[PDB]
Amino acid sequence: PVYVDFDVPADLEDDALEALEVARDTGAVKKGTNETTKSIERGSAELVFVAEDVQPEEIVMHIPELADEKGVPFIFVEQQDDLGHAAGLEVGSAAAAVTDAGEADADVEDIADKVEELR
RNA sequence: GAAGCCCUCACGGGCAAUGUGGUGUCAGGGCUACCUCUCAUCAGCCGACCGUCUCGACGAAGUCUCUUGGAACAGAGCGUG
Numbered sequence: 098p099v100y101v102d103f104d105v106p107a108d109l110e111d112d113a114l115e116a117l118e119v120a121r122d123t124g125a126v127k128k129g130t131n132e133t134t135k136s137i138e139r140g141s142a143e144l145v146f147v148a149e150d151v152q153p154e155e156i157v158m159h160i161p162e163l164a165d166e167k168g169v170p171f172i173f174v175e176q177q178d179d180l181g182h183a184a185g186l187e188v189g190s191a192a193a194a195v196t197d198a199g200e201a202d203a204d205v206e207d208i209a210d211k212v213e214e215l216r
Numbered sequence: 217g218a219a220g221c222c223c224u225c226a227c228g229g230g231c232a233a234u235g236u237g238g239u240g241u242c243a244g245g246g247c248u249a250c251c252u253c254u255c256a257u258c259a260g261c262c263g264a265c266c267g268u269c270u271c272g273a274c275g276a277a278g279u280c281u282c283u284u285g286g287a288a289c290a291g292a293g294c295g296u297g
């Protein structure tokens with residue numbers, strides 16, 4: 098909420114999670130705020146997800162600005178456990194990063210595009 | 217970066233991407249590229265001597281004479297470990 102600066106429509110979040118699921122099956126994805134953080138720093142990240150029900154918020158507060166000064170596009174998910182399920186985890190995930198999609202590159206592109214428009 | 221931990225005989229359950237586990241800890245470390253090599257460390261297995269304290273077993277040689285005395289464990293004489 099303090100790091101969130103725009104609401105994402107359930108529909109968009111839907112497409113993003115699906116795109117993320119086919120990303121792990123095909124391409125490569127990072128699970129965890131730390132791994133997600135290094136990817137954004139090493140530049141090996143295409144799309145990073147960030148849960149919105151993260152408490153404490155400090156764990157993810159840095160993702161937004163870090164992503165901006167790195168061109169890396171990012172999107173919010175209303176729930177932490179979905180992101181983890183989608184990321185293929187048996188647990189939750191405060192943040193996620195698609196380290197190069199996989200037969201989803203097309204979708205990822207649009208989502209990023211759609212997001213930028215959503216400001 | 218799930219390669220992990222806990223409970224249960226098992227089935228199964230719980231924990232864990234807000235990081236279990238690997239690596240590492242100033243002879244700094246890590247990574248990339250090399251040489252060599254380990255007996256350092258950490259973990260676990262086995263597992264005492266001796267010594268000290270206490271307890272216990274075993275363990276030599278007179279119960280001879282006279283006198284005094286209620287009593288010899290005394291005096292005098294002979295004898296022993």
Ligand SMILES: [Sr+2]
Nearest residue numbers: 178188189190
């Ligand atoms: Sr959780």
